[PDB]
Design a protein around this ligand. Structure first.
Ligand SMILES: [Cl-]
Ligand SMILES: [Cl-]
Ligand SMILES: [Cl-]
Ligand SMILES: [Cl-]
Ligand SMILES: [Mg+2]
Ligand SMILES: [Mg+2]
Ligand SMILES: [Mg+2]
Length: 263
């Protein structure tokens, strides 16, 4: 809706940074609204959904088991790993790792899952195979969060990842069991949800993944809608701002508030 565009522009002005935005109709994939939809932005932790989609695709193909236990070491632990920090001695199952990676944004969990699939290049190959010609993962956590000026590594476009999310959550790319598991992880309660959850009306559905990185990078991908069912995909990205984190979050949240008000 045009009012949302005005709020996207106001966010650019307040943040001193580009903001990319797309809304899709979930059933049809029709683009309902867009701003800088084909410009590149860092993925940051939004990639963790794509990662777990690649894992679930392997499960469906009999190449991975959700109950397989992954053993790792102290040196595998990277910053912002609140779940994996608690399982050095006992390990974690693949299922537990995806839950941590999505719901808790656990960085080491994502790195371990990347090992299970064979690395960033294998994620990128999975994306290409399902028809995403843009998204790329090149590095692991935390370096993928760098957000360097002029760097194409670890980026997507709003349009590309919106379409990819729709492929993962709807249709037949994943089995029903895997689709539902991915949605369940994305819908699970989180510690704080400033970007969209804070705007979402009661009774509405949201399955989301946020991301935050260096150099102003921030984003969210979501499927949301009224009456306990999703009906739209929304993607919002920004990078480059040196405003405070609170200001970044507030500006993105106001985009979401507009989307809901003008739904
Ligand atoms: Cl535009
Ligand atoms: Cl564009
Ligand atoms: Cl492995
Ligand atoms: Cl959030
Ligand atoms: Mg060991
Ligand atoms: Mg649930
Ligand atoms: Mg809840």
């Amino acid at each position: 809706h045009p009012e949302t565009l005005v709020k996207v522009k106001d966010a650019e002005d307040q943040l001193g940074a580009r903001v990319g935005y797309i809304e899709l109709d979930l059933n049809s994939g029709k683009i309902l609204e867009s701003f800088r939809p084909e410009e590149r932005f860092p993925l940051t932790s939004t990639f963790k959904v794509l990662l777990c989609g690649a894992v679930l695709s392997r499960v469906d193909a009999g190449q991975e088991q959700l109950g397989r236990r992954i053993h790792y070491s102290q040196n595998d632990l990277v910053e912002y790993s609140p779940v994996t920090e608690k399982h050095l001695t006992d390990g974690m199952t693949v299922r537990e790792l995806c839950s941590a990676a999505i719901t808790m944004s656990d960085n080491t969990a994502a790195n371990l899952l990347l090992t299970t699939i064979g690395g960033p290049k294998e994620l990128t190959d999975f994306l290409r195979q399902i028809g995403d010609k843009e998204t790329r993962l090149d590095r692991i956590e935390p370096d993928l969060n760098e957000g360097k000026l002029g760097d194409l590594r670890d980026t997507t476009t709003p349009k590309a990842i919106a379409s990819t999310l729709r492929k993962l959550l709807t249709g037949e790319l994943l089995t029903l069991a895997s689709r539902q598991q991915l949605i369940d992880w994305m819908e699970a309660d989180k510690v704080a949800g400033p970007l969209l959850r804070s705007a979402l009306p009661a009774g509405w559905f949201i399955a989301d993944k946020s991301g935050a990185g260096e150099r102003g990078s921030r984003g969210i991908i979501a499927a949301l809608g009224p009456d306990g069912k999703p009906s739209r995909i929304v993607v919002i990205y920004t990078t480059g701002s040196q405003a405070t984190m609170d200001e970044r979050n507030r500006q993105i949240a106001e985009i979401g508030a507009s989307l809901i008000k003008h739904w």
